[PDB]
Amino acid sequence: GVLKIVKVYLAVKRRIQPGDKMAGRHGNKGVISKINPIEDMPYDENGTPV
């Protein structure tokens, strides 16, 4: 009793934001709490931020 089937695929790009869960290879997981601007991150003698 089925005549036709139409399938539609939608693609969306997800960015990073507070609340997303990140981790590492040594069991150190965590949740992002802030997106700090560049001129507030700590920097070294050469001015490269972290």
Add this chain to the structure above:
Amino acid sequence: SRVTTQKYLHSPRGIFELKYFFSSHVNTEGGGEASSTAIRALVKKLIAAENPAKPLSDSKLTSLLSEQGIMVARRTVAKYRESLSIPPSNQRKQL
């Protein structure tokens, strides 16, 4: 007559009554016959492609059909159209 009552058949086209296949006939050019259930489809096709400003009347459908050798009277065409629930020619025109 008894067997074909209220029993349905499933074809790739759709589901039918199994009594939908028994139909009437009208004469044809060459001594053959043409079924009413095919003349209804032809009439629907012709009406669904007419000029919207000038719709085809029953005579202009009878004459159009009587060039493939279908030999249908005008009143029969009117009966088929009213069976298809299609308004007359004067009620299908539009701007």
Add this chain to the structure above:
DNA sequence: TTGTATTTATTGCAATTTTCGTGCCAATTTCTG
């Protein structure tokens, strides 16, 4: 030996009603002079 109670086999006929296409013609629209 035959007459009979028992058990299958039988999914059709023939009236009676309903529907078919198409003609007659009155009522309503459209058209050209």
Add this chain to the structure above:
DNA sequence: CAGAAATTGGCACGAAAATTGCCTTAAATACAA
């Protein structure tokens, strides 16, 4: 303007088609006299 041509559908034909109510037993078979 208006008479005429064109269109539409109710009603009427015979014929065909479709339904519906019934013959509410005849013949083969195994058993008994």
